Amino acid sequence: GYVVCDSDKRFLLLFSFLKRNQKKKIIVFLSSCNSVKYYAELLNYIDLPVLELHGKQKQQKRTNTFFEFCNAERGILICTDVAARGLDIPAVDWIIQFDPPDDPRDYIHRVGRGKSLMFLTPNPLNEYEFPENKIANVQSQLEKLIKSNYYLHQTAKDGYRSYLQAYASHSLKTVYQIDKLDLAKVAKSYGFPV
Amino acid sequence: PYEPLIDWFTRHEEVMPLTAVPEPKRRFVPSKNEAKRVMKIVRAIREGRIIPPKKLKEMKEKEKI
Amino acid sequence: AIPRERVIKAVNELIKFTSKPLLEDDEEELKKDLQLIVVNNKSFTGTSKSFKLKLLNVKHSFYKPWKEASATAVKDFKVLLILKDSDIKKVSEDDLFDQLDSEGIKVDEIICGKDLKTVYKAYEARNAFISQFSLILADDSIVTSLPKLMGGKAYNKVETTPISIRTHANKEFSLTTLTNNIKKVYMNQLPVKLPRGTTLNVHLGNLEWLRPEEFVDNVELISEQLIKAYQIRSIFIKTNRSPVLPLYYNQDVLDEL
Amino acid sequence: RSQSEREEEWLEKLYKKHGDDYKKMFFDKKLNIYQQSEGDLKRRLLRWKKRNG
Amino acid sequence: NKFVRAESIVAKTLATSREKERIKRVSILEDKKAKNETQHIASGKDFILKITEGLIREKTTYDGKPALLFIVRVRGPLAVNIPNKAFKILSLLRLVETNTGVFVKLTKNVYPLLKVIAPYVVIGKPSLSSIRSLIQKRGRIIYKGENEAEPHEIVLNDNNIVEEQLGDHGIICVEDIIHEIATMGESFSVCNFFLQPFKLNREVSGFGSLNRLRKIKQREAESRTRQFSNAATAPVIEVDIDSL
Amino acid sequence: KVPPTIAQFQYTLDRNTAAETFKLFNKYRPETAAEKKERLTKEAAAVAEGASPKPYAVKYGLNHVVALIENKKAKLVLIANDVDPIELVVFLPALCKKMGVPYAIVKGKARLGTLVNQKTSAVAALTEVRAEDEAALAKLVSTIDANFADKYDEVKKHW
Amino acid sequence: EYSGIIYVSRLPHGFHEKELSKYFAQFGDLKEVRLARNKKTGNSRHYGFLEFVNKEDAMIAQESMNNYLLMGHLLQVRVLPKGAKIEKLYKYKKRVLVEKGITKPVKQLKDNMKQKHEERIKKLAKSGIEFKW
RNA sequence: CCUUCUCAAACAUUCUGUUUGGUAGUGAGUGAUACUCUUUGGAGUUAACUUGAAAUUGCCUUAAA
C-alpha cells in the first residue's frame, strides 16, 4: 500500500531493501530520467549490480539490457515511469515507485497486471509499520563518497535538481512544493541544498 | 534618532546558496599548480642548479668543522 | 563423550520451534536465527573480570557462510585488524588481499592504536565505527591497552570485543605469522567470553548455517573442550527464550562444594 | 610533438593494469588521480601506443 | 595567592587518576613477584631498557648483581601531583627539589622502588669521570657555622672538614670519598648521606629569545629519549649519564 | 552614539571561549612560505628520482570567506572588530545570520593574523576539518551559539 | 525569587566533589556539595548540586559558568527558586562482591537440582516441544 | 586542556609452530525467559537496542614573569 518515510530516511530505506531482496526481482520507479543516472551509479559502486534504464541512453542499449532483465532469474533494474510503459514483466514481486507519479489515476492501471507501495511524509492494500533502528548505516560513508569523485557529485547534482523540478511540475494538492530542502539534500547526501 | 535595527531580512534563514555555480574538477582533483611547481624543480635538479635536500646535509657534514 | 543422538533431537526440536506462523527485520529474524549453547559452572573466574576471549577450536567455519550471506543481510560482515604503530608503516592492505583472497577472506580496514585515541575518540564516532564490524582482531601487544581506547560498549557484545592475534616471530614482526593466525582464528576457532558469575552462553550464531548434521560436530567439539579444561555443571542448547534443551548434566562436580 | 617522460610512464602503469578497460581506469584512485574522463584518457593511450606498442 | 582556573583543577585529578592507578598496578605485580605466587601475572622477571645514541632501544634482563646508579630529578609529568608512595621514596632519596642528583646502589630490593619513581627520575650507571668531576665541581656539607647556627650547607673546599666529620671510618680526603662512591665499599653509606644531594643546574636555564627556542628543541627531545611505559611490566629506562 | 549594526561588534567573545577557539584554530595553520617551498623541494628531490590527501587549513581572505559564507562551505567564522574601514565587515555578521552560518566576533585583528601567517586578517574561517576534531568543532560552534548568539539576541537593537 | 542552591550539569570526566568544592570555593564560602553517582561502580553521573551561604554568590557563579567549554563538553549551570533543597545524594564508592555460597549440604542441592531438572524436562511438554531423556 | 597498562615465558624451527599467563569499561535509559547461589534481599550472570561525552536530587615550580 505505502510506507511513511522522511526525505532523510527515503533513500536510506530503499538501500535497506535492495541488499536483502538481492534474490528477488523488484522494480524501482523514479520521476526523472536524470535521477536513475545517479542511483544506478551508487548501487553499482557499492556492489548491488542493478540495471540502468533512462531516456538519455541509446535505444540499442535500452533494448539489449531490458531484454536481459526478462531472461534473468535474480536481477534488479532501475527505470522511469514513462520508459517502462507497455513492456511490463510478470517476473516481479515488488512494484515500488519511489517518486510521486505522473498521473495519480493511471497508476492504478499500472498495478493490476507484484506488490505496490509508495513513500509519503509530505503526501486497496495495507500500510507498512517500519522499524527506526535497523536502517543501514551507509550515509556518512556516502557523504565521504560524494565529495571525492566529482562524477558522482555531478550525477547527484542533476539527481537532486531533476527530482525537485519534476516535484514542482505536478498537479495534485499534496505534491505542491512543501518539502523543505534541509531534508531532501541528505537523500542525495549534501551539507547544503546544492 | 536611535531606533533598534529591526532585521527585516535576516529573520528568515536561507536554505540554498545564492548562486547555482557548477563546482570545478580542480576542487576534487589534486592541484595542477602544485604539479607545475614540482615539474619545474625536477628540471632544476636535472640541470643541477638546485642541489637536492638529501645532499644539502652532506654539504654541511663535510664543512664548518 | 556426549550422545550425538540427543544433539540431533535437540536441533530438530529447534527446527520445529523456528518453523512457526513489518518490512524490516528488527527482532523477528534475530530470534529466528540466534542459537546459543549455555554452559554452567560453580563460579567461572570467580574474582577476576578479565576480558579474554577463549578461542574454542571447531572443525568447520561458521564465519564463512556468515560472510557469504551477510552480503545479503542489511548488517554487513567486515573484517577489522587493529595493529601496532610500526606495522602500518611496514604493511599495506594490498599484501593482505594478495595472500588472503587465495582462500577467499577479505580484510576490510587496518587500524592503528593512534586512530582509536584521536579520530575515533568521539563517543558517537567510536560507537558507530565498531558496531559496523563483527570480527575484531588485535595484535597481542595492543589487546591489554584496548579497554580504554574503545571503551565499555565495545565490550558488552562478543563480536565487538577483540581477539588476541600473534604477529611476532621472536618479537620481530612478520607478515606470515599474521597470515596463518588470521586463518586459524577465522575458520578453526569460535571466541567466547568468561564472566565472573556462573552462567555462560556460547554464541554459535544463526541456526540457518551449516546443515544440522554439521551443527552436531560444532556442539560436540565445544563440549569436548569446555568439560576437559574446566569442571562444569550443566549444558543447554537455546534459541532466544525457548523452553530450554538440557544436553549435559553432571552430578560429581557439586560434591566438592 | 611528443608526450612527457612522466606522463608516458604513468600511461604504462595504466595499460599494464587495465589494458583497454577505460571505465575501470576512470574509476581508479591509485593511478588515475586527476579524475580525467575516458575520452581524455584513451586519447593519451592511442598516442602512447604509437611511440611504443 | 592567585585564582585557579577550572581546566587546571580537573587536569590535576585526571592525571593523578592515571598515576594512582598506575602506582597501585606496579605495586601489585611487584608484591606478587616477591612472594613467589607467579600463577597468573604479565611477567615474572625484570627487563632494563638502555637507550643510547639513530636511537637504539636495547632489551636486557636485570642481573642479581649490585650496580651503581646516579638518579637525576626531571620534573614530569605535566599536571601530576605526587601521591603518598612517591612522597615516601623521594623523601628517602631526598629528591624533593627539581634538578637534584643522588647516588644509590641497585639491588633486588632497590629495583622495585625504581619503577614507582621512574616518571619523576632519570637513571643510569655513571663512569669514573662523571662521578669524580661531579664531586669536585659540586658538593654540600650540612654542619655547624660560626658558633650558634646549624643549617649551613657550604662547599667541599677542604679535606680537614672530611677528617672531622668522617675520619675514623678510614676516610681522610675528598678523593677517598670518590673512592668509596665509585667502588662499593664499607664507608659508602657513611659518605652518601654526607654529600646529601647534589645541585645540578637545569638545562638551557632561561625564558627569552634564544632560551625559549632551545627549551622547545630539548622539550621535544625529551619524549624521544624517554618514554612512560605506564604498564606493570615497565622496562626501566637507563640513559647515558656521561652525555647527560 | 552608535547605530545598532555598528557596535554589534565590541560585544565580543569571552576569555575562556576565545582561547579554546584558538586551541582549535592553531591546529589549522596554513603552511608558511618557507615550509611550502621546502615541501616542494622535498617533492622535487623525490619526484626527480622515484598519493597525497587534500590538506585542511583555515580560510582567510575576506573575498574567499564571503564566497564561503553563502555557499555553505563555512562552518565557523571569526570576525575581528577593529578594522580600518568598519564598513569593510559590517554586513558580515548579518550575512552569516542569514545563511545560518555560526559566527563569532573575535577581539584583536592582529590576533587573527597570528593563526594565519599574516600581519592582520579581519576575517578567518574554518571550513573543513580533520576527523578527530570534527566533534571538537561542532561543540565549539554550540558553545559560541550559546555565549554569543543567544547571549546577545539584542545586539541587532540598542544604540 | 532565587536561592543559594545551584544545579550544575555536563561535568567533565573526573570533576568530582573535591574539585567542585575547591573551584567554587574561589567564588566564596560554599555550604554543602554533592555529586550523583552509580552504585554498581563508583563513578560520576556527570551532574551534581552545591549550595552557597550567599544567594548573591549563587547568581554570580551562574552568570560566569552558564556556557563554559571545559574539556570536550560545556558546563551548564542553573539557579534554583525558593525551596527545592539538596536532599539525598550519597558518596558511592566501587562496590565489591561478597562470597556467600556453600552453607547448604551437597545432598540437599543435588536433589534440588534433580527436582528442577525433571521439571525442566516436564516444561518443554507444556508448549509444543517433545524431547527425550 | 594531561592523554590512556603498545608483551613475556615453556616447549618446537614447518623461514614461525604449539602452549601458558596478561585488559576493572562515560553516564542514563528501553528490553522479550533462562541460569546457579541465597533464603526474600536481589547476589552474580545471560540476547539485543537507544545516545551530538546527552544528564533535576535512588538510604616537583625556569611548565615563569
mmCIF file of N, CA, C and O in Angstrom, chain C residues 146-173:
data_model
loop_
_atom_site.group_PDB
_atom_site.id
_atom_site.type_symbol
_atom_site.label_atom_id
_atom_site.label_comp_id
_atom_site.label_asym_id
_atom_site.label_seq_id
_atom_site.Cartn_x
_atom_site.Cartn_y
_atom_site.Cartn_z
ATOM 1 N N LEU C 146 43.458 -1.873 25.023
ATOM 2 C CA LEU C 146 42.183 -1.630 24.331
ATOM 3 C C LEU C 146 40.889 -1.391 25.135
ATOM 4 O O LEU C 146 39.933 -0.857 24.563
ATOM 5 N N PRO C 147 40.829 -1.775 26.440
ATOM 6 C CA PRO C 147 39.618 -1.411 27.203
ATOM 7 C C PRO C 147 39.408 0.098 27.376
ATOM 8 O O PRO C 147 38.266 0.544 27.520
ATOM 9 N N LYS C 148 40.501 0.860 27.356
ATOM 10 C CA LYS C 148 40.454 2.316 27.472
ATOM 11 C C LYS C 148 40.153 3.000 26.133
ATOM 12 O O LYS C 148 39.297 3.889 26.074
ATOM 13 N N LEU C 149 40.846 2.572 25.073
ATOM 14 C CA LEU C 149 40.770 3.215 23.754
ATOM 15 C C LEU C 149 39.430 3.061 23.035
ATOM 16 O O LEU C 149 38.993 3.989 22.346
ATOM 17 N N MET C 150 38.785 1.904 23.191
ATOM 18 C CA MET C 150 37.493 1.654 22.538
ATOM 19 C C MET C 150 36.290 1.573 23.492
ATOM 20 O O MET C 150 35.147 1.421 23.047
ATOM 21 N N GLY C 151 36.556 1.692 24.792
ATOM 22 C CA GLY C 151 35.506 1.812 25.805
ATOM 23 C C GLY C 151 34.792 0.526 26.185
ATOM 24 O O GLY C 151 35.183 -0.564 25.755
ATOM 25 N N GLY C 152 33.736 0.675 26.986
ATOM 26 C CA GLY C 152 32.976 -0.449 27.552
ATOM 27 C C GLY C 152 31.857 -1.012 26.693
ATOM 28 O O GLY C 152 31.586 -2.219 26.737
ATOM 29 N N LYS C 153 31.207 -0.139 25.919
ATOM 30 C CA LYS C 153 30.133 -0.520 24.989
ATOM 31 C C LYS C 153 30.634 -1.465 23.889
ATOM 32 O O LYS C 153 29.877 -2.299 23.381
ATOM 33 N N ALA C 154 31.916 -1.329 23.543
ATOM 34 C CA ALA C 154 32.601 -2.234 22.622
ATOM 35 C C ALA C 154 32.855 -3.620 23.226
ATOM 36 O O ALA C 154 33.203 -4.561 22.509
ATOM 37 N N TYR C 155 32.692 -3.741 24.542
ATOM 38 C CA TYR C 155 32.963 -4.995 25.248
ATOM 39 C C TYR C 155 31.696 -5.723 25.712
ATOM 40 O O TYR C 155 31.763 -6.892 26.108
ATOM 41 N N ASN C 156 30.553 -5.034 25.644
ATOM 42 C CA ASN C 156 29.250 -5.596 26.039
ATOM 43 C C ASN C 156 28.742 -6.712 25.116
ATOM 44 O O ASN C 156 27.961 -7.566 25.549
ATOM 45 N N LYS C 157 29.184 -6.692 23.858
ATOM 46 C CA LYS C 157 28.923 -7.781 22.911
ATOM 47 C C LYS C 157 29.998 -8.865 23.023
ATOM 48 O O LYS C 157 30.824 -8.848 23.942
ATOM 49 N N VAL C 158 29.963 -9.818 22.090
ATOM 50 C CA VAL C 158 31.010 -10.833 21.934
ATOM 51 C C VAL C 158 31.723 -10.597 20.594
ATOM 52 O O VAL C 158 32.907 -10.919 20.442
ATOM 53 N N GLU C 159 30.987 -10.020 19.642
ATOM 54 C CA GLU C 159 31.509 -9.631 18.330
ATOM 55 C C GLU C 159 32.541 -8.501 18.432
ATOM 56 O O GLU C 159 33.657 -8.623 17.916
ATOM 57 N N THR C 160 32.163 -7.424 19.121
ATOM 58 C CA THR C 160 32.919 -6.164 19.116
ATOM 59 C C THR C 160 34.193 -6.161 19.978
ATOM 60 O O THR C 160 35.091 -5.341 19.755
ATOM 61 N N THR C 161 34.266 -7.065 20.955
ATOM 62 C CA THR C 161 35.483 -7.257 21.763
ATOM 63 C C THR C 161 36.566 -8.014 20.954
ATOM 64 O O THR C 161 36.247 -8.999 20.280
ATOM 65 N N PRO C 162 37.837 -7.539 21.001
ATOM 66 C CA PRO C 162 38.909 -8.053 20.133
ATOM 67 C C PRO C 162 39.444 -9.445 20.472
ATOM 68 O O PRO C 162 39.261 -9.935 21.590
ATOM 69 N N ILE C 163 40.104 -10.050 19.485
ATOM 70 C CA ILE C 163 40.774 -11.346 19.618
ATOM 71 C C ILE C 163 42.289 -11.142 19.519
ATOM 72 O O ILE C 163 42.785 -10.558 18.548
ATOM 73 N N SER C 164 43.006 -11.632 20.532
ATOM 74 C CA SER C 164 44.464 -11.540 20.596
ATOM 75 C C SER C 164 45.133 -12.413 19.528
ATOM 76 O O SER C 164 45.072 -13.646 19.587
ATOM 77 N N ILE C 165 45.746 -11.751 18.549
ATOM 78 C CA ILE C 165 46.460 -12.417 17.453
ATOM 79 C C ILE C 165 47.972 -12.145 17.544
ATOM 80 O O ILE C 165 48.393 -11.007 17.773
ATOM 81 N N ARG C 166 48.772 -13.204 17.399
ATOM 82 C CA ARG C 166 50.232 -13.098 17.419
ATOM 83 C C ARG C 166 50.770 -12.774 16.027
ATOM 84 O O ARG C 166 50.440 -13.451 15.047
ATOM 85 N N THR C 167 51.588 -11.724 15.958
ATOM 86 C CA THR C 167 52.206 -11.273 14.704
ATOM 87 C C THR C 167 53.740 -11.232 14.796
ATOM 88 O O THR C 167 54.419 -10.818 13.847
ATOM 89 N N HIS C 168 54.273 -11.678 15.933
ATOM 90 C CA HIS C 168 55.700 -11.557 16.227
ATOM 91 C C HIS C 168 56.447 -12.892 16.292
ATOM 92 O O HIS C 168 56.199 -13.722 17.176
ATOM 93 N N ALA C 169 57.353 -13.081 15.332
ATOM 94 C CA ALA C 169 58.275 -14.213 15.310
ATOM 95 C C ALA C 169 59.557 -13.824 16.043
ATOM 96 O O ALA C 169 60.421 -13.128 15.490
ATOM 97 N N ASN C 170 59.655 -14.281 17.297
ATOM 98 C CA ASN C 170 60.711 -13.894 18.256
ATOM 99 C C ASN C 170 60.790 -12.373 18.476
ATOM 100 O O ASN C 170 61.876 -11.779 18.451
ATOM 101 N N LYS C 171 59.615 -11.770 18.690
ATOM 102 C CA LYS C 171 59.411 -10.315 18.891
ATOM 103 C C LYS C 171 59.524 -9.439 17.621
ATOM 104 O O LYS C 171 58.968 -8.337 17.573
ATOM 105 N N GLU C 172 60.225 -9.942 16.601
ATOM 106 C CA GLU C 172 60.267 -9.301 15.279
ATOM 107 C C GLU C 172 58.958 -9.553 14.535
ATOM 108 O O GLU C 172 58.480 -10.691 14.479
ATOM 109 N N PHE C 173 58.389 -8.489 13.969
ATOM 110 C CA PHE C 173 57.160 -8.583 13.176
ATOM 111 C C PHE C 173 57.406 -9.283 11.838
ATOM 112 O O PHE C 173 58.388 -8.996 11.144
#
